[PDB]
Structures are given as structure tokens and as C-alpha cells.
Amino acid sequence: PEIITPIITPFTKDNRIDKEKLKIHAENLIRKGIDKLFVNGTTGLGPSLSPEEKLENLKAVYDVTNKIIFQVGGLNLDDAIRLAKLSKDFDIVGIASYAPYYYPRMSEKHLVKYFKTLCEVSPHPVYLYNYPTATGKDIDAKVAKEIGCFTGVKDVIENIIHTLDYKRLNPNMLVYSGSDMLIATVASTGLDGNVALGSNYLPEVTVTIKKLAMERKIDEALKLQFLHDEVIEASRIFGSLSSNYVLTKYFQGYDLGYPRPPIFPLDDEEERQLIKKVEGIRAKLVELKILKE
Amino acid sequence: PEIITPIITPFTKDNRIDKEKLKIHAENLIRKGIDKLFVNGTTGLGPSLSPEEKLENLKAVYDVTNKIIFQVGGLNLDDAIRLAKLSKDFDIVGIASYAPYYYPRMSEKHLVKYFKTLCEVSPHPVYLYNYPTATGKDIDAKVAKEIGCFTGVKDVIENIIHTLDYKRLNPNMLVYSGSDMLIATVASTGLDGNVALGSNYLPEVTVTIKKLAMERKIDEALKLQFLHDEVIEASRIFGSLSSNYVLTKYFQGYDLGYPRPPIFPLDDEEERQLIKKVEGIRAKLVELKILKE
Amino acid sequence: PEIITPIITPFTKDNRIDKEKLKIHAENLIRKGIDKLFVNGTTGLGPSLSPEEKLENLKAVYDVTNKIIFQVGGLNLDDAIRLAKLSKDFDIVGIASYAPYYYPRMSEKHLVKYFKTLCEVSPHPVYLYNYPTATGKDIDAKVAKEIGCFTGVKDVIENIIHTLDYKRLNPNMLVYSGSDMLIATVASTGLDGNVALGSNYLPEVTVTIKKLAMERKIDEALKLQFLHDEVIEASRIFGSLSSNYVLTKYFQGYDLGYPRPPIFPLDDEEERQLIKKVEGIRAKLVELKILKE
Amino acid sequence: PEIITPIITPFTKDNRIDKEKLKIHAENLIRKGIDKLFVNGTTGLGPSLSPEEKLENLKAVYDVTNKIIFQVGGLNLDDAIRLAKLSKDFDIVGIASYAPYYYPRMSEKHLVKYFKTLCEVSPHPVYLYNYPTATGKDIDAKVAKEIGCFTGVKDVIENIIHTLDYKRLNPNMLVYSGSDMLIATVASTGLDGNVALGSNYLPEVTVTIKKLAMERKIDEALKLQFLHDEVIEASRIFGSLSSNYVLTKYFQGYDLGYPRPPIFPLDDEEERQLIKKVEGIRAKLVELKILKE
């Protein structure tokens, strides 16, 4: 099983992608044992990025590692098809696309066509980015098999039956979970790991949970999972997307700049009060020697 | 009360806004009694348009009428701010914005700041575009009061209490409904009108339904309202965002081009069947003399 | 249009139906202008009542008025069929049944059979008691027409499109709304009125809203609707089912005893604090002379 | 971990509990490795049973095994209290109760008092039966701690995080899952077992799936788990509450009679098709020698 990082997108104060901070972050992640980097996902504000910025993220992370999965979806097919085709000159793992978002109650025929269209033009493996809440629709294991070109899938959902059903109807298919709270459970049940936002700021923890569960040390893996759960919950107090920046700076040293409004940054006060609820968690992670003081 | 068309965006076979076909559509809608025009809404594929293109829609429709509500929402705040500002040189009704979409569980603080921001920069009345299903968050009567700079609201929701509650807490706010199926109901219960997707292809009807109920002939209004309900339902067969293009050509007699993929046009086969579904309905409206022969 | 009362079931301290208090309440209701009394509904804890107690309520209210609709549904068909048949000796409006509750995802065939079975044996008109939330399933206007024996329907839902669709596919059918917050809107849109829990403790208000909306005085009817809304909301603070007893005693004089645990009564403190939030409302109802001091 | 059967209730053609057929079913389940028996659950049509009949189920199954969890829930508190008390003369595992069903938006106060009440009277360990979909309210990990007298919980829910969270906040509580499709997953992630509807007709499988995963052969466990998933799905064709009767007779070779209408039996025609759906599955289990010829 793997741990993939939907890598944050650091923005400058003038709202420009910080290519240089993004690189320092990708290095720390690969350094600390992350398997691949999932680019332009929700955690990096993919839908907030222009086709040229979605490509920036690729080009800046490709200076660091070629263990990349490249998300290209939007509400303009010609834009996505271009991004799919330009990735040909990048030796990477694959490209990804979430279902066309916003517009509710799209037909199963129109969604299957969107994905098949991207397979017809892709120069790399195609991963499905199934996120029913964010997109408004669910490409479940049945429609995934109907489309029939998905090398893998990130299933962002709380129902683990839904996720396992991909591996049931699509046996050859890689099946990752988007939930950070199921890292220990996904590792132990025979799926191919997790795509973990929380690994942006605690890659140490996400990897160690994976290892403990791999070692059939489940009682221990749950000890550490539940701790990571408490951080996922603290970041939720002030908007997790905006708190993901604060928590990477607190746990990993370097800062990642700013998010893109309306994903507003935390102010100095929200930052203090958030640090105040993970101090205790950071300490026990140090006492367990999972983190360096 | 008023009938407002969330006006379709015609696209060229090259995925380009057809400014001339849109002008034709605006003229016709106004000639047939549409009060105002809602530009860059869901029906018009706003979330699929760029800021440059959202602006193109404004300038193109402003060439024919200035009864315009200019939607300017997106996931980049600076873009919405610039659009809002540039409207200053236009004599229009107001600007509007849906809540930032996609991202789940945004903080009420972040949400309120997004809207209050657009108010601080707006050179025109600010209307709330409330669409919980598509955007993934609800700006209810309470949060609207909290923001407290909305001249009006378009509430796309099944719960009509929700709609009435904007008038309960904001006694001076215009409250419209996003339902085509409540044109008669809204009029009769003292709400201010309907932003009707279906007024794109049957303005005569949407305006007549309102008329009858306001003449206190509620039984005649339901009789015609129920006829319009069948056109709404039939359009939903092949995805109503795409079927509006086929229905406007059928009923209003001019071409509106294509939608923007992943909002796929209907093919010859699907278009053929949809017209069969509404053949009879056209006949009942031509008998009742709501439509020209 | 009508106002029907899903009449409370007063219980004694030893948890026995208080036939005598129930009668005093039914009289006040008919006295104050309520059209019919809906017996064994949610508001009277129907599902908490044994087949013999469901019959008690009938026999005790039939000493007062024959304007009764008699709810008989449960999870035992033989029990319901008996109650349907014993009502033959009562000259009343009809019998009612909510869809079989609790068990999720029952088949459309098994639900249509439950209702048709009760029509085959009923000696009175059969009303549908559609409450999707309480029962877990929705007998929408299409399945109502499929069953094809419903004289009417109480539609407990916030979506008024759903409710109107009964009158669209079932034109002969009586269509009442279960929502107390749509009394003014239902009266004005051409449906046959409301079944109002709130008329247990403010029948004066529910009737006056109906009358104002009947008089096409909608701006005035909304004034009074929104007030009733504030009481529906106050009763919600402490469990509305349990607060319905306190609010009938506060506004109508007589007390109705106790509810049936786990619908626990309010304690003296919750009763005081509830009275504290409707004092102001009771006053303005007096100043508008809708209520006698 | 453990496998627990929510044991079916056999009914006579006269809508009467078949105490002798139930005894047969209990014996067989125990002989085939079922740890305990959950009496008067959803699968057993508890909410359709009277207190007298819920008690009949206890005495009948207690004639064969005392590994019983005695469900005693209802909408009359006194009834549940009396059932709880009468269990004192039995050497059973515990008593259980779902949250009071039907009535929406019950107060957390009223809910907690309902459960704490059953604890104050219980002569046995109290297990929480958590089933948000059917009952209409969720007793999550936090409210369980707040009540704080539950030896264990059966969590019928798709969100497996929800389930893990009982163990997070209540480190000493037994946490079971109500999913047949997570027998392998639960075992492997350190949770305490599954209350499986499907163990009624395929105990051999449900116990084997658990076995394999606990022998660390997770790939073999999924292989058999996915086979059981097809039996769950097929049963759902004609309503799985009724299909269990047909599947137990098919697989275990004895008759369990009828369910209780409105939980309608399958007819000759529906029963015929369901067996066709599971013909092949029986073959794969007989080859793999999980079933006798």
C-alpha cells in the first residue's frame, strides 16, 4: 500500500503560484517517504486554478520527482484535453480528473463520455478522482467499469463499502482512499493505500500508520490513527483547506505562503489558537519519537 | 412580481460565445415580456465561463437591454472583484454571485467575508444567488441578514419555507425563486417573482402563469402551470441544461448554437425524441393561443 | 380550504388515555372553527398507541364530532385491517394510514400492496398520510395515482412542488399540507388547506391566516404566518411534541396531561423558559385582537 | 472478533411466532459457529412485535442457547422497562435497544434520558443498537460516551469512521458493525465483529470470512467476502427483509415460515427467480467446500 499527497499549492501575496516554495515542499514529502504526489487535487485548490496554473504545478513538481499523478479536470473539455496531451512529454505515473463539478444531476451517458473522451487522448494512465460531495455526482464502481479505462481511483468518501466495490468489479484496478481517517483500516483490508491531505503536514504520521498496519500491528496503528484524527479535527475548526498551510509550517518548518481567496488565510489569531490545540498532539508525537523535536 | 430569464449562452462550434445569436435571444425575450435578464447563471453555464467570457456576456446583452443582473462569481476572488468593478459604466439592475462552489464545509466566516467583500467593491445593487445543491452550501435567511447588503435573492431550492424566510428576516429584500414549477405559487403568496430556466424557450407561458394568478384566476394559473411542468420534466430526460438549446429553437424558432462540453449537446436522435415529447404541449398552447401558429 | 387538527392525545400520570381531557380539547377545537380532527397522527403519538388505544381516541372524539379522519396504520396489517373495518359503525370523513415506518428501502410493490389492501377493506374514504421523514419512504403523486384509491392526502414535507404534484396527477384528489409554515401559501395557491399541529394550541391563528389568505389579503396573512412560525420555532427548543402540551395549556386554558415516554414531558423549568419566549408573541396576538386576554 | 446473527422471526400462516421453527434455526446457527444471537432486531422484525411477543422470542431462543442479546426497544418506555427487568432470570449476554424511532428531531436530552433509563433498570449489560437510517437519529460516539453505560454497540451505517469512533472515545467498548459487506474489513482493522443479516442463511461463510482475515489471509477473505456481497445484493431484489426467509430455506434446508405483513413474503414467482440468482454462488461455495453437497 501507498501514501500519496494531494500537494498544497503555495501562493504568493500577489496571488501567484510560488514555484520555489512548492519545490521545497515536494522535496520534504518525497524525502519523508511519500510514494507519489497528486497534483491539482482539492487540497491544492485544483478547481481554483487556470489551465496554465494547473500546468505550472506539474512543471514545478516535475523538477523534483516524476512520481506524479496529474489532475486536469475542469468545466471546459478542450482545456482538459489539452492538459492531457501536453503531459505526454512528462514521464509520470498518470493523469486524473474529477467528475465535472457544480452542475447537478448530469446524465450517466454525459459523464461516461467526459471520462472516455479523456482516455481517448491521454498519453498516460488515467486515474478516476471520485469525490461525490465536491462534484455533486458519484462515479461508482459500476460506472467506473462501464467507462473502462481507469488504472486507479481516489475514492473520497466515508463509506468504505463503496471503495471496496471498485476492487470487486475492477480487480486489476488500483484503489486508493481519499479519507485520512481510514489510513490504518485501508492498509489492513487489502486496498492500495490512501491519498492523504494530512500527509502535507504530518507525512511522518501517515507513513508510520501505513507501516504499523502493514506489520499487522493494528492495535498500535489505531493508537496513531486516532491521534491524526484529532489533528484533522482541529484543522476543521477554521476551514481545513486554509489550516493545512498553518499545520505544514508548524510541523515541517517551512511555510507555504497563502491560499487563494475565497479560501482565505488564517489570521495571526486563528493561527495561534490552532497551534494551541495541536501543541499537546505534537508533544506525544515527539514522545513516541515519530517526530524530531 | 417579475419573470427573469437566466439567459442561455450560445456557443460556436469552436467553443466560442456567439455574441450575435445571444443578442437575438435577448431581443426576443424582452419583446415577449421578460422583466430582466440574469447573465452568467447556471442556465447560462457561468461556472464554465472565464472572467473575460463572463464580461463578454455582459457587453453583448447590454447591447440590447440594460435590465441585467450581472453574475460575477468564481473561485478566484480577484476575478469576481474586477468584474464587479467594471460594471460601473453600465446602467444595470445589479451584480450577483453564487457562494464559492465545490469546496465542502467552508466556514460561515469565510463565506460571509466573500460576500461582504463583493459588496464593498460593488458599484451596483448586490443580489445573492443561493443554490445549495450546486454550490454545496446554503446562504439561508439568517446568513443573508448577517451579510446584510443584498438587495434581493434568487433561492434555488425545493423548500419554499426557506425562500419565504428571507422575507421574514429581511422584510425589505426582494425574494425570487429558482423554480419554474412555482411561478403561479410564488406570485400568489406575495413573493417577488421567479428566475425561470424555462422562460428561455417559453416566455409567453411563464409570464402568462404569473399574469393569471395575479388576476386572482388561480385555477387557470395552475392549469397552465401544470402544462409548463410537463415541459420542465421532458427537458430533464437528456439533461435540461443541454435540452434548453433544443427547446428554444423549437418554440422560439431561432438557433442558439451549442452548449459547452462537458455540457454536451443533444444529437439528432435525442433532439428528435424530445420534440415528440413536447409536440402535444405546443398544440395545447397554440389552441389556448399562448403561442403563435 | 380547510384547517385540520392532528389532535393531541392527553395521557394520565399512570400513562392511560385521558378520554375526558381529550373531549374538552376536541370541543374547544371545533368551537374555535377547526374543520376536521385528524386522529392518531404524529402529533397525537399514533405510532406509540396500541390498536385498542387508537380506537379509544376515535370513540372519545366521536362523542364530540363526526368530522374525524381516523389514522389506523402500523407494522401489523391484521391490526390495521381490523381498525379499518371497525370504523364502519362510525359516520366519519375517512380513515388514514402513513406508509409502513422504520424499515428502510421497502419495494414500491410492497408499499402499493399495503395501501391497496386497506382500500379493499375500508368502509370509508381512504386518505394517504405521506410523511417521508417519519416513515423512511415517500408515496409521491405518481405512486399515489398507481395505488388509485386515495380520497385525499396530508403531505408532510417542506417541498411544495411535491405537494402540488398530487393535484396535478390526481385532479379529483383532496390535497392538504402538513407544514404549519405554509398555511398562508397553501390557501393562496389553490390546495385544500393544511393539517396543522399548531392549531392544537393556536386554532385562532391557524384559522385567521386561512381567512386572510382566502380574502387575497396576502401581505396581512404573511404578517400572521411569520408570527405562528416563531411559535413553531420556540416549541422546537425543548422537543415540539412535548412542548405542544405546554402551549395548548398556555394559550387555551385547559391542560392535556402528559405525553408518552420516551416523549418525555417538559419539567417546570423548561415550561417556564418556553412561556418566556412566547409571552411577547401572545401579547401581539392580543393587540391584534386575534386572542382574548 | 465475533459473528452475531440478528435472528429471523418465523411466523405462522396465522401471523403467530413459530416457536418450534425458531428453535430449529437457533440450534443450527449455534452448531455452525455463531457466537451470539441478537433477538428482536430489524432482521427479526422487532418493531413489528409486541412486548409479549418480544418476550416470546427470548424464552423460545433461550431454550436452545443463552448466548443472547435481548432487544427491548419501543415507543412505550414502560414496555421496554418491563422487558429489561424480566430478563433478570436469564443468563444472557445483555439487553439492547434502538433509539426511539419514527419521531424526528428528538432532543439529545430526551434521547439520553431514554437510554440512561434503560440502564438504571437493566439487570444485564446494555448494548446500544445504533441505526440512524431506520430510527431517524444517530447515537454517535460522543452521545454514547455521554450516556456512558453501554458495554457495546451495533452500528448500522455506511460511514465506517463513525464506527471506529466509538472505540476512539470509548476505548473499552465492544464495537460491532451492522454490515455483511465488512466482515473481512472489520476483523482486520481491530473491531470486535459483525452483526450480519446474512449469517441467517450463510453462517458458514460469514464465519469463514472472519476466520481467513484473522489468519492474515486477507486476499482470501476478500475473495469470499465479495462472493457474500453478491448474495446480499440478490436478496435486495425483492426486499431483503423478506428474502432472508427464502434464502435460509434454500441454503440451510429448513422452513422458517412467513414474515409479518407489511413485510410481505415472496411469492412462488419471486422465490423462483431469487434462487436462480444464487444458483451459481451455491456452486462456488460447494466447490470451495464451504457448503455441504
UniProtKB/Swiss-Prot annotation, chains A, B, C, D:
The EC number(s) this enzyme carries: 4.1.2.55
Parts forming coiled coils: none
Thermal response of activity: Extremely thermostable.
Top EC class of this enzyme: lyase
Something else known: The metabolic pathway in Sulfolobus species contrasts with the situation observed in other microorganisms where separate enzymes exist for the catabolism of the two sugars, glucose and galactose.
Oligomeric form and interacting partners: Homotetramer; dimer of dimers.
Classification via NCBIfam families: Arch_KDGaldase (NF040954)
Functional summary from the UniProt entry: Involved in the degradation of glucose and galactose via the Entner-Doudoroff pathway. Catalyzes the reversible cleavage of 2-keto-3-deoxy-6-phosphogluconate (KDPG) and 2-keto-3-deoxygluconate (KDG) forming pyruvate and glyceraldehyde 3-phosphate or glyceraldehyde, respectively. It is also able to catalyze the reversible cleavage of 2-keto-3-deoxy-6-phosphogalactonate (KDPGal) and 2-keto-3-deoxygalactonate (KDGal). It is equally active with both D- and L-glyceraldehyde.
Protein name, as recorded: 2-dehydro-3-deoxy-phosphogluconate/2-dehydro-3-deoxy-6-phosphogalactonate aldolase
